[PDB]
Amino acid sequence: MGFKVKLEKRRNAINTCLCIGLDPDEKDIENFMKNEKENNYNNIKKNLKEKYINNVSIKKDILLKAPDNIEKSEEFFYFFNHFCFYIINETNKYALTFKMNFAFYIPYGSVGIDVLKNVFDYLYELNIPTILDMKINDIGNTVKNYRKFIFEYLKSDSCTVNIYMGTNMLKDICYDEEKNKYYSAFVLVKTTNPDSAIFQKNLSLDNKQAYVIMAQEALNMSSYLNLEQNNEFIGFVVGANSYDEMNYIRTYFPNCYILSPGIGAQNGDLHKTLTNGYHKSYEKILINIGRAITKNPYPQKAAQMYYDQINAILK
Amino acid sequence: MGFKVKLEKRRNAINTCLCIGLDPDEKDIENFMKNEKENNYNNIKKNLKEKYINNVSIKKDILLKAPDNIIREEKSEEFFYFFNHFCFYIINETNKYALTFKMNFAFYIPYGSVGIDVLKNVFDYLYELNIPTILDMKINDIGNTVKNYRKFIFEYLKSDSCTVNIYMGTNMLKDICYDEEKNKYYSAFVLVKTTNPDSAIFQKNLSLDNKQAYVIMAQEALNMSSYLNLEQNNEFIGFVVGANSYDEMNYIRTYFPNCYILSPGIGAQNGDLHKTLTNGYHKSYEKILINIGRAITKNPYPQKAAQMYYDQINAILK
Numbered sequence: 066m067g068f069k070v071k072l073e074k075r076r077n078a079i080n081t082c083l084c085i086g087l088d089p090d091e092k093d094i095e096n097f098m099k100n101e102k103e104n105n106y107n108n109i110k111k112n113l114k115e116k117y118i119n120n121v122s123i124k125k126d127i128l129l130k131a132p133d134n135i136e137k138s139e140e141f142f143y144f145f146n147h148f149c150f151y152i153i154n155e156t157n158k159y160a161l162t163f164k165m166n167f168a169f170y171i172p173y174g175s176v177g178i179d180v181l182k183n184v185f186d187y188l189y190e191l192n193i194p195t196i197l198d199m200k201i202n203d204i205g206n207t208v209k210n211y212r213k214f215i216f217e218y219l220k221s222d223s224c225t226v227n228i229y230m231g232t233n234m235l236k237d238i239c240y241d242e243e244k245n246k247y248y249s250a251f252v253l254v255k256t257t258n259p260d261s262a263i264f265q266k267n268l269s270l271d272n273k274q275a276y277v278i279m280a281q282e283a284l285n286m287s288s289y290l291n292l293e294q295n296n297e298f299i300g301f302v303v304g305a306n307s308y309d310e311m312n313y314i315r316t317y318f319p320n321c322y323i324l325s326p327g328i329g330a331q332n333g334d335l336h337k338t339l340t341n342g343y344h345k346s347y348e349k350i351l352i353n354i355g356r357a358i359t360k361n362p363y364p365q366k367a368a369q370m371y372y373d374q375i376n377a378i379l380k
Numbered sequence: 381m382g383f384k385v386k387l388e389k390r391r392n393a394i395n396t397c398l399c400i401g402l403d404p405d406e407k408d409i410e411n412f413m414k415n416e417k418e419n420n421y422n423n424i425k426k427n428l429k430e431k432y433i434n435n436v437s438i439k440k441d442i443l444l445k446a447p448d449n450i451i452r453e454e455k456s457e458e459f460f461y462f463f464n465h466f467c468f469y470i471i472n473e474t475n476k477y478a479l480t481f482k483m484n485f486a487f488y489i490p491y492g493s494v495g496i497d498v499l500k501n502v503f504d505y506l507y508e509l510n511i512p513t514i515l516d517m518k519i520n521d522i523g524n525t526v527k528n529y530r531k532f533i534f535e536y537l538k539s540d541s542c543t544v545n546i547y548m549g550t551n552m553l554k555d556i557c558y559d560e561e562k563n564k565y566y567s568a569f570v571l572v573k574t575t576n577p578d579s580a581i582f583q584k585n586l587s588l589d590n591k592q593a594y595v596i597m598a599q600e601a602l603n604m605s606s607y608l609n610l611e612q613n614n615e616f617i618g619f620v621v622g623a624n625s626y627d628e629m630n631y632i633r634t635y636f637p638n639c640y641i642l643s644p645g646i647g648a649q650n651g652d653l654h655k656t657l658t659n660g661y662h663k664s665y666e667k668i669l670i671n672i673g674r675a676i677t678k679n680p681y682p683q684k685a686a687q688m689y690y691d692q693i694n695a696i697l698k
């Protein structure tokens with residue numbers, strides 16, 4: 066159940082340290098519909114056969130109601146949801162973990178959160194580890210709501226956090242006193258955008274860069290609260306492009322957990338001190354590929370490809 | 381339109397830079413629900429009479445309906461019902477003293493999609509009331525992903541502004557404050573100095589050219605607000621400067637003339653603007669917004685608490 070261990074069993078059961086990213090945007094949804102409606106809803110039908118589609122708890126009465134609209138108020142809700150069910154049913158067998166970015170589930174209103182819950186409900190019935198990338202941040206009082214929403218409502222296994230506002234965040238995010246329970250988190254160390262770090266790098270304390278002070282601070286916080294046992298942990302978000310830095314964290318923080326995005330789209334080099342710099346028992350270095358798989362004409366295949374070339378561990 | 385202008389008008393209309401915070405949690409809800417229901421729906425019937433409650437777009441048929449989904453005819457709509465009403469309640473009771481209202485997203489998502497429906501209603505309500513608004517969601521992500529937050533915030537909610545955590549990078553602002561396909565501009569407050577205690581390991585103990593991070597980030601915030609011609613368009617990129625950081629405050633105010641500042645932390649985390657807080661960071665007060673939240677929304681007599689802070693801010697403000 067604990068992350069470390071849930072992530073350990075599944076690693077064996079399938080190897081690979083791939084993390085499929087499920088960030089469906091507005092066009093992913095209209096295309097899946099545009100050419101699903103004009104194909105007799107074959108994929109949605111394939112889904113509807115699944116079975117595990119029954120933990121899902123929001124508008125179950127609409128979700129499992131054979132392909133139809135009227136275009137009813139629930140049209141959009143339908144399809145969006147199914148597009149997600151579709152990807153999962155065809156990619157999970159290659160995934161060690163699924164990572165959903167909250168951001169894409171909120172621009173249309175509550176309808177998108179409903180879907181988020183059904184997705185997390187789904188990934189949860191299959192026993193697939195999850196990551197809600199929302200990189201939360203706020204004051205202890207407030208942060209407590211993100212901890213509830215994330216680990217209590219969605220039953221997620223972990224989530225990303227931005228501790229710039231202060232590292233004590235984690236004590237309210239990774240630990241719930243009222244009921245004990247410990248959770249896992251991923252702190253933002255080095256991100257994947259070009260103007261990336263004139264902060265994570267140009268900034269420093271005694272000439273030790275900011276992403277190191279931050280990386281070090283985050284770890285000393287998981288020492289207190291003793292996550293490591295309890296079967297949880299606090300890891301880092303280190304971009305695929307940040308080759309130099311990746312190799313440094315893996316050396317100074319050798320048994321650490323890493324979540325690295327940026328490959329497949331966002332430009333990338335799977336190999337190269339990425340899956341090498343950061344190597345370890347692979348599940349300690351999750352590679353995330355979203356669009357490269359989710360935007361490809363016929364995925365699973367893409368998945369498989371990544372699985373395979375990721376399975377190329379000459380180590 | 382234009383945030384600066386919208387902020388400018390209301391100011392002269394009520395003379396005050398008081399930003400009320402509406403961060404409703406569980407106990408505010410159930411207590412509201414029990415009080416009201418104990419003393420037979422005094423405030424709800426009141427809400428049900430307010431003009432703009434008829435313009436809500438989500439489950440309008442439910443919010444308008446003789447006292448509660450009571451539990452006997454729905455139940456499942458109960459929570460939604462009382463939650464939303466507690467908010468209408470606070471806005472109806474304290475809006476006259478507010479220059480701006482600021483809702484923290486964190487309190488609207490813990491219960492799933494039901495809280496978002498309430499949030500949307502709260503924002504539609506203030507919008508009809510035409511009161512400046514701030515969604516404190518302190519967003520941050522790679523651009524083109526951040527656009528989604530931009531849509532949710534300024535398209536769906538039609539909020540005048542949001543708060544932003546620029547740490548991952550400043551270019552993120554290009555996609556939050558500017559649409560660039562509808563040629564639109566938006567306001568924002570980036571986290572500079574926060575009310576956390578250990579709020580300085582990174583914001584202070586970090587430096588670049590003799591400067592502490594919080595200063596450089598404000599500089600990066602601005603240079604970016606210049607690049608996007610948002611200010612020429614009546615929008616802007618301001619700062620979140622906690623109330624318990626007097627020096628940093630005066631510092632910022634001093635070296636950054638005419639900078640919109642958002643400042644939370646009076647009563648709840650200690651402090652009191654009464655003093656240095658609003659003196660430091662003075663100016664034609666919109667520039668300096670004093671967010672007072674839990675001291676009003678959790679107070680037994682909210683219209684009363686809001687007031688107190690009104691005159692208090694009026695006095696010190698001279």
Ligand SMILES: O=C(O)c1cc(=O)[nH]c(=O)n1[C@@H]1O[C@H](COP(=O)(O)O)[C@@H](O)[C@H]1O
Pocket residue numbers: 086088166198225255256257258302304326327328329330331353354355356357521522525
């Ligand atoms: O998820 C993250 O923590 C993340 C950190 C970062 O620095 N850069 C970054 O792109 N990401 C994530 O990368 C995801 C997209 O993966 P792709 O679709 O393969 O680009 C987004 O949902 C972001 O949340």
Ligand SMILES: O=C(O)c1cc(=O)[nH]c(=O)n1[C@@H]1O[C@H](COP(=O)(O)O)[C@@H](O)[C@H]1O
Pocket residue numbers: 203204207401403484516518543573574575576620622644645646647648649671672673674675
């Ligand atoms: O950006 C903010 O909203 C914020 C930044 C900060 O550094 N400190 C801080 O307290 N806040 C906000 O202050 C609000 C609470 O106001 P109080 O109830 O008066 O403490 C919270 O909802 C926070 O979102």
